Amino acid sequence: KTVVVTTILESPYVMMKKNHEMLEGNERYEGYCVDLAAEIAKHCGFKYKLTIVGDGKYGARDADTKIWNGMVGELVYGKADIAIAPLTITLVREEVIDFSKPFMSLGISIMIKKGTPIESAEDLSKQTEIAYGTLDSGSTKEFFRRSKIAVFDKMWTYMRSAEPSVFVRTTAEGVARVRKSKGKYAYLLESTMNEYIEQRKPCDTMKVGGNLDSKGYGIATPKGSSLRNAVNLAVLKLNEQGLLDKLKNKWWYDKGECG
Amino acid sequence: KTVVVTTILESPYVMMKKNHEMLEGNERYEGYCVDLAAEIAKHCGFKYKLTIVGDGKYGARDADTKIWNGMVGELVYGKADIAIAPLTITLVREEVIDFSKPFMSLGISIMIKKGTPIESAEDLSKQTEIAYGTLDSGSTKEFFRRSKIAVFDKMWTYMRSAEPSVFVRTTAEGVARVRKSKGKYAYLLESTMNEYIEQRKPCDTMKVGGNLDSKGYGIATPKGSSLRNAVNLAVLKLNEQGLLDKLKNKWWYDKGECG
Ligand SMILES: O=c1[nH]c2cc(C(F)(F)F)c(N3CCOCC3)cc2n(CP(=O)(O)O)c1=O
Ligand SMILES: O=c1[nH]c2cc(C(F)(F)F)c(N3CCOCC3)cc2n(CP(=O)(O)O)c1=O
Ligand SMILES: CC(C)(C)c1ccc(C2=CC=CN3CCS(=O)(=O)N=C23)cc1
Ligand SMILES: [Zn+2]
Ligand SMILES: [Zn+2]
Ligand SMILES: [Zn+2]
Ligand SMILES: [Zn+2]
Ligand SMILES: [Zn+2]
């Protein structure tokens, strides 16, 4: 039967094509995870329907209702058969679904406006001219809250107390604050998105320094899924064939706007 | 029985309190519609639980499955008893749920970066230096697509074909696009949100021109609800008591940042 694929509208993983209103089904979409889904489906021998997650979320368990939201919720409640998306591999998610081996690495990184005299996390931690922050309710904030590393502890102590708030509700808001004329703000976010935005007009931001942690994105299936093993082996095959590296280069660089 | 209220996290209608993690139940939330819900419940004599709509949407019928999403779907399918939110009164919605009389007026409006030489839709339509657009899916786009008014037809013809795309996925994206544009992008959106953002730091956007249409937000109940009549009379009583105007002033202006 037709496999229901849950995914999320996040660039460049899944984007609406030019002329999407004239198109139907899977042809409406393009991007890294659209290309990845087509290859996974070929290698595993299934036909599929791409669906955009109903709530636009990745997946977390509400502490009060005990209900999972996002793509993880769609898998655990039987709304979708597989999630093919930049879904971070985490312990609480692996307790309720199965992840493939990762298809992409990422880590916390620093975004500056070009010109800002900052090249690293240590640089941020040792000055006060440039403000810095992150999403108000996510994994980057939690990384800093829990860290026992001196540099990151110093950064957290600053961020938690800073006035006005250095936290933002969205990346659109965070990047707008980086870009504001004489804004003197740096934004902490996933390296993959920082690198992506660095390749988009107006070409005024950059990723600086090394990543602060190491994580991976994986494909997720529900417990006991007949697809688990084949999907896992397919991710490894695509890596060994060089296809994952080719797709990253395609969507970040070949289609990049900053030279 | 405890009435289940569906609502949506949209500022300043319903927002998480700063200290929401320390709070429980209805006390976690604040905003115009939180104040409205408390007064409607008092007038109608019910106890209630505020819930945030699972999919984060207002309500539309999928053209293929024919299934309603959002708060409208929660009412239609029996998941909530009442929706107390900035839910626009429309024909297709009124066919499937009942709306109260409106509690607030709105219409499509133009957001500019301060200093942009635009005072009206006609001004936008007669030039090309300043790009303009709206949400990629929604009622504003549909208004333009369907209009027979010469100015609005001219605007639609431009927007539908503009490259790069003038459409955005979210208002956070639209507002950020206005803010970095040096005035070369204007964003079309509901007047109530445009007015709200004009009162938020960094105080660099303005609402300009008259509204392009006239609509209202209403409280919605499923067909056959025993609450319909009382909710409707309550909305009228609150208006006659001055409370609706008092709440709009409280949440838009008393709590504004640009005065
Ligand atoms: O599984 C997850 N995958 C995620 C993938 C991405 C992206 F980079 F776009 F791929 C992001 N971006 C963060 C930067 O702004 C744009 C959204 C967030 C993700 N989150 C929430 P977080 O871990 O709180 O950041 C997850 O949970
Ligand atoms: O019932 C509806 N009520 C809505 C109320 C609001 C708000 F202004 F926040 F109150 C908005 N905003 C549009 C501007 O960006 C933020 C969200 C959208 C609404 N939509 C979707 P639309 O009609 O496609 O715009 C509805 O359907
Ligand atoms: C008193 C308040 C609450 C300010 C109000 C809000 C909206 C309207 C309204 C005007 C014209 C057309 N329509 C379309 C049907 S509507 O959405 O029910 N309302 C209107 C009138 C008064
Ligand atoms: Zn067709
Ligand atoms: Zn909850
Ligand atoms: Zn919070
Ligand atoms: Zn009253
Ligand atoms: Zn589009």
Swiss-Prot record, chains A, B:
All ranges on the Extracellular side of the membrane: 116-259
Positions of modified residues (Phosphoserine): 147, 181
Binding positions for L-glutamate per the UniProt entry: 86, 88, 93, 139-140, 190
Modifications made to the protein after synthesis: Palmitoylated. Depalmitoylated upon L-glutamate stimulation.
Domain of life assignment: Eukaryota
Disulfide bridge positions per record: 203-258
Subcellular localization, as worded in the UniProt entry: Cell membrane; Postsynaptic cell membrane; Postsynaptic density membrane
Cited function: Ionotropic glutamate receptor that functions as a ligand-gated cation channel, gated by L-glutamate and glutamatergic agonists such as alpha-amino-3-hydroxy-5-methyl-4-isoxazolepropionic acid (AMPA), quisqualic acid, and kainic acid. L-glutamate acts as an excitatory neurotransmitter at many synapses in the central nervous system and plays an important role in fast excitatory synaptic transmission.
Annotated family: Belongs to the glutamate-gated ion channel (TC 1.A.10.1) family. GRIA2 subfamily.
Miscellaneous note of the record: The postsynaptic actions of L-glutamate are mediated by a variety of receptors that are named according to their selective agonists. This receptor binds AMPA (quisqualate) > L-glutamate > kainate.
Subunit structure, as described in the record: Homotetramer or heterotetramer of pore-forming glutamate receptor subunits. Tetramers may be formed by the dimerization of dimers. May interact with MPP4. Forms a ternary complex with GRIP1 and CSPG4. Interacts with ATAD1 in an ATP-dependent manner. ATAD1-catalyzed ATP hydrolysis disrupts binding to ATAD1 and to GRIP1 and leads to AMPAR complex disassembly. Interacts with GRIP1 and GRIP2. Interacts with NSF via its C-terminus. Isoform 1, but not isoform 3, interacts with PICK1. Interacts with CACNG2. Interacts with GRIA1 and SYNDIG1.
Domain notes from UniProt: The M4 transmembrane segment mediates tetramerization and is required for cell surface expression.
Disease: Neurodevelopmental disorder with language impairment and behavioral abnormalities: A neurodevelopmental disorder characterized by global developmental delay, impaired intellectual development, poor or absent speech, and behavioral abnormalities, such as autism spectrum disorder, repetitive behaviors, and hyperactivity. Some patients develop seizures and manifest developmental regression.
Protein name: Glutamate receptor 2
Whole-protein coverage range: 414 to 795 of 883
